Symmetry: D3
Subunit: 245 residues, 6 copies
């Protein structure tokens, strides 16, 4: 059996449930999803300050996952907070949802467009594009100008704004696919794909498949050099529980 | 059930058997592998001239796969010949082995090294690095200075040269993983991974998992814009059978 | 005397005549133009599938040119299909028309705009910009949204649409020159240059001058390393005639 | 008067004293240095896991600095952990020591070389080079293969290894200046500059001057868009004290 | 005491006075500003021809500054003409105003917009962005379509056009700061910063602070390799006075 | 008839004669070469200071050429000093020898190596590679560590050092062609091409062919936007004769 810990980096249990449901919907036979969120942190991630807090919350759950002996990890917010930090701490592979969505997009289209939540998160997505090397593959980046948690507020306004922005993107951007720029849009991907007749990609589902793929290939994070286990040292105060290994 | 057509772009049946075996070894339950090679073409791909011939052979098999109604396709040589051409013709996703190996490498290491066959193929690998956007993620490229088919000649010389070059790469390059730069090295990946304690990645096995992943996600090649079906026109002579749809 | 084989990669004899006329119009004293097209292939090139077919047709004519002992070769479609493959097979220099037009544009302007045929060919032009290294030198890319062969249909609609798009480009793009993105626009270049008072560049005429230049300099394709003659191997079926040397 | 909070992101008081001394040595008349370190965290930063912990410790001190009404902030470790997060939280400018050292290097030399502590920190420095846009300005990156705190162990071994590596860099790399890749090397910069007759740059001292410069120019972090104050939300557990504003 | 030679590369005494006033307004206690312009040259710099003339005028003043034994130099036009040439000739640091403004902008914002004078100077600013490595940090470049000296013509039209363009930039570009693209806009920076509540940066004032910073750090131009004193040779005619050292 | 002004940017008449001879050796029937050098300037160009002086000397000769009504211009030193300035002033096309050599190299090889004079000129060549967009096409840059005028000193030492460095480059660099990095190496190109059996390219001869090509194509520098004639203004002192038009 394969056990994958899907970590929502924010403390919203509502978003954790949406992310968890999306992960189970595409999970292969024999795969168990462990949908979790940090005990302490931020309800939504909307900037660099929120990401720095989320990164430590991710590491808290990574530690818990490694203690449980899970096969892999997913970081389920579009900023992929603490990705490389998590890879150092974890033995199994760690996949970010932005990373996974962008990787899948290059396999089904020449260029993709990103539709995300707030304007101030666009720069974070731009940095990830350069970091992962997909900047040339991204035709345009768009924000719906609503807070992250608007996707969970029951109104359906954010979902409709994503839909409308996806249609506009396919007409103007010169792209063949859409990358959804939030973990909250996870369930909207399958509906828009069928409706718009183009790949509309959710990173949550994509990252699950990447972990499953790597485990089946017998591949895990390289412990040689850059992503080796953290150097042995004493952590103080609030951080002392992060590395008991 | 999932049916994946794994196309060896060269006409070597020996290499087709090695590629086919590697694909079946990692295939998920319910996945059938259709290992094929072109009826006409080149025995091995060792340059730009060979690639141009291989690309048309790929398209010949893509057509056959689409007629059979396969779920996806794999292009099983490290130059990914005719990748975008194949995506236009095929309905299901088409994944190159260089593409897949490089994508997996960025998920398990910060930087990777490439170990391939001939010096003259290095430029092709360099172009693909820039095209896919992984140039910054590649620490170094290496060639063992033996012809592609030396991996099939039974001597074990090419296999030992790959091993020795992998050890040297991990010591000098400042990389955490190895990408094997040939479809003939497909079976060597699992042995070197266990022996060297680092991810040594085969593109053949990786591409199979990518096709399986995309099919499970309900994602296929975008037929909107760049990778749309080829424009309706009459093909003459040797090419007339390529697009009966 | 200098003999230059100008290869139209598509099978349209009408386009071959337009390309041939443009080549002879700028040819230096003592230069003979051999305007040719493949015996088998595609009537027009409008995507990646068409390019893969065209590349082999180019190689067929390259072989014929080398047997005849021509001094150089021109690949006369804006995707420069099979350029590096042709350079391996040929002894004399091989120049693509996109390559040549872009090279000339950087010599007469700081930045240039591209005006081509179909929207789906734009990505091909974008890839060539990155491959040749002129991406920063290209201010914008534009398509007239008509099929390639509309330039040969006698209506004059495509020609007028190119004209109108050239005027708009010079006003909006912040560029000093125009690169015509088709072999069919070859004869329109001189008229628009005089009319718009800016360099409007045809790749066909430019590539002829590049071949003439290289021959006069006593320079041909390097047979050391990457562009060396293809490795000796047996080609099967439809490809057996490609390398009799 | 100008008050600058210099934050050592690690919990080593020994390194905090070295950093504090370097800051006061170059401080302009009327400038008070507030040398601090986090109450909880990691003794030294040697990888991505350490950086994620350090980033939150930085934010803890940023909050304290803003409450005190300081004019600016310095992040005094070569990974510039939590730089953009700190800029969101703080009103005054926040300057990283890697950022500052690299900025100064481009003003006194065409290209610079980096001499840092551990091999595994090189990738972090490489990422910062790309992020800040100085990758082309960096000729080479070097590590002395000793832990960060070796600079504080009293042996003088790390200091001598830095010296020897600086001499080798100036001979081999083709660079005109050296950037010291640690906050612990802060006091070594002035000695090597005089001895080697080239700019050997400490980021700590450089960042102090940048804060002083920006304050004198009447410039602070832009609160429009990306680096605006964090969105109002409730932080839980260990993070609740980070944003009382 | 610190003496900084601020060189206006154009021969406009009116612009020299504006530049000189801006330099003195931010100068630290003990700093003397030597505001100068060339004896021969061009009244305003509006293209590549003007820049080549200005570069030699800069060198003329650099020589004068070095003879006087000044601590540093500022090149006070947005094209930074003869920057590297000046660094070779001078002993003290030489800072360009475009260089300094761009460097400061990356410290207070994620991305910046440029507002300059003429459309034809935009390409010069684009080249400097690539040369200094801040191309990714620049969201947009804008020109007010008025000659450089319009800022000195007393009408206030150019100043109002800069203001209006700054407001439009902050609304459309997705940037957090403005870089003023002329030495004539030097005094407008402080007013727009207070009015628009964002960093509006003048390169003249910024470059002064950079020179002061480098002098306090005990850092000057590297005379090892690329920016070494010019090779000893005899200059003829109009240039004979440029290198008496 | 076609008249091409070949400008040696340095004041060495010996180098002017070598450059002039190389230009006439490849000149087409009907082409007259006007080999010139500035009346005032520097005997050799070995750094940024020398280039700034050379640029104005180029403009002096450009003015003379335009008054004479020449068809085009060549800037015959490997730094292409004042290239864009010259294009503004001149009506006919202006081609740099570094520009031309690099352009030809991409047409005959995948990657090229540069062999130049002094180590301190390498950075200038590196900047031109980035500016022209051929950085990825350049495998390596090499300097023979002799002054520029050593090629004219009659010893044959510099010529032998170029030869030896060319052989080493072809063995180590992984390149297919050599670009000679000086106007003094102009006559060595044909001998090394025949001897080493690879393209060894002289920029002087290449630039002549580019001017001839552009004239035959009826193409000249764009006077729309960036390379328009310099704005009408009064030049003072030593520069007053530069723009009488
Ligand atoms: N919406 C985003 O851009 N990032 C996110 N913030 C979250 O809290 N979850 C996300 O995916
Ligand atoms: N070895 C390679 O670099 N490319 C290849 N040529 C082949 O025939 N198969 C390959 O994978
Ligand atoms: N128009 C293009 O973009 N490419 C072309 N297709 C052709 O058939 N000829 C071309 O030049
Ligand atoms: N030495 C480094 O590369 N980074 C650092 N780790 C620390 O603890 N301080 C540093 O400057
Ligand atoms: N306005 C500019 O873009 N450049 C300049 N020309 C000048 O004369 N001074 C400048 O700053
Ligand atoms: N050798 C060079 O790199 N540049 C040059 N200096 C000159 O004087 N002529 C050149 O070509």
């Amino acid at each position: 059996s394969v056990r994958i810990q899907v970590i929502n980096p924010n403390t919203s249990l509502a978003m954790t449930e949406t992310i968890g449901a999306a992960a189970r919907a595409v999970a292969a036979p024999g795969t168990e999803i462990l949908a979790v969120c940090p005990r302490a942190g931020v309800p939504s991630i909307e900037g660099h300050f929120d990401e720095a807090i989320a990164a430590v919350g991710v590491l808290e759950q990574i530690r818990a996952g490694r203690e449980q002996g899970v096969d892999g990890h997913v970081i389920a917010s579009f900023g992929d907070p603490g990705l490389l930090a998590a890879r150092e701490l974890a033995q199994g592979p760690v996949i970010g949802i932005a990373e996974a969505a962008m990787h899948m997009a290059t396999m089904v289209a020449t260029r993709f467009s990103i539709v995300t939540t707030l304007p101030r998160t666009l720069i974070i997505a731009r940095h990830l594009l350069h970091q992962y090397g997909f900047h040339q593959h991204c035709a345009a980046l768009h924000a719906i100008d609503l807070p992250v948690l608007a996707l969970e507020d029951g109104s359906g306004l954010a979902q409709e704004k994503v839909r409308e922005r996806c249609i506009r993107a396919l007409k103007e951007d010169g792209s063949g696919a859409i990358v959804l720029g939030s973990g909250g849009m996870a369930t909207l991907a399958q509906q828009l794909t069928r409706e718009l007749r183009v790949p509309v990609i959710d990173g949550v589902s994509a990252a699950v498949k990447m972990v499953e793929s790597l485990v089946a290939l017998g591949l895990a994070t390289s412990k040689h050099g850059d992503l080796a286990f953290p150097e042995k040292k004493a952590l103080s105060g609030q951080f002392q529980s992060l590395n008991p290994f």
